Amino acid sequence: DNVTSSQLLSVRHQLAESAGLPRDQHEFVSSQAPQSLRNRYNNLYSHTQRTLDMADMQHRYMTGASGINPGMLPHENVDDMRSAITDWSDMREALQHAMGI
């Protein structure tokens, strides 16, 4: 354990850069939304916002930029957003799959 703010910010940007299903997939989420169960996108999107915000909060606190302790440890943010990355690369799999029908 023992997670650095530089390490954290690195995992933050990693999530932000990967929170993006490709064009031809999104083209058919607002046009051929596979069922209803695939709100899994828009639910994940908002969750990823929540994750990224809390991560950004965490950083400022560690850096000394702000005095608001977000409420969880730095390793809890990495564990949350490293998790969130899988969620995206599953969406991208789930969509490719469901749309190829």
Binding site: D1, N2, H47, R50, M54, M57, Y61, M62, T63, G64, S66, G67, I68, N69, P70, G71, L73, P74
Partner: protein, 292 residues
Amino acid sequence: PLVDLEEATNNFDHKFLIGHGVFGKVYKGVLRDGAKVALKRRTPESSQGIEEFETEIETLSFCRHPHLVSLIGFCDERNEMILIYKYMENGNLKRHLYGSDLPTMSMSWEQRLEICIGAARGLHYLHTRAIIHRDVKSINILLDENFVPKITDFGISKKGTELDQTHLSTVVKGTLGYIDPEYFIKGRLTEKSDVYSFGVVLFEVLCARSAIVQSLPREMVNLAEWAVESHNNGQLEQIVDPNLADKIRPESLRKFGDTAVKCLALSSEDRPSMGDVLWKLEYALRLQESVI
């Protein structure tokens, strides 16, 4: 400080155990004299941990209260800075409220109130001494072998000049769920800022929603907001708590919830003093007995 040197010096090599913090870690240890002890080693990430280390020295030199964690000693030797306290057997209040593990089931309503009263007594004393805690939370309320509550962590606490009446002005500090919104939106700090914070702990005790700020459910994310949405106008909800069953006398439930609602008033002007908070809590424990 009446007596000056309580400077203990370098024990052993570290036995990996107990809690972890953002600025430094905490270990259990036994001293040469057999005393079970708690070492807040603040060497991990020196991002102005220096300031908070010194703050927790001078604030805690007023070491004379049953509901304030007693400082045993400090370090500041060969780059290190460790603070030393008596080991609290039962850990923190959060641990006993829908955290995780250790059986024999949940706490009782009496026990819960006895804790809230004890915590109030500590905070009230701090206000007597113009010390504003600023970081009141379930994590920061420790309890011993006999479950006597003790207020810990003073790295963020502030001392005033006028003593009691202080409505001072500084940078915003605290934990996300517990920040006095008036202190957040305006930058004005008051002793009543601890009252809002304690107000959250109150509902945290009640609902066992010891998660407080919860980024999963509906518009019920903020505990200090979802609970007010009820025991204020929406319901006076008996539905908000876990399995405290039919164990709370309805009249004490109203009293406890009413107090906790009053603590969370948006403006600090309307909030009760910890003094009154204290009397209210004792009276709510009292409100568990008499016939028609």
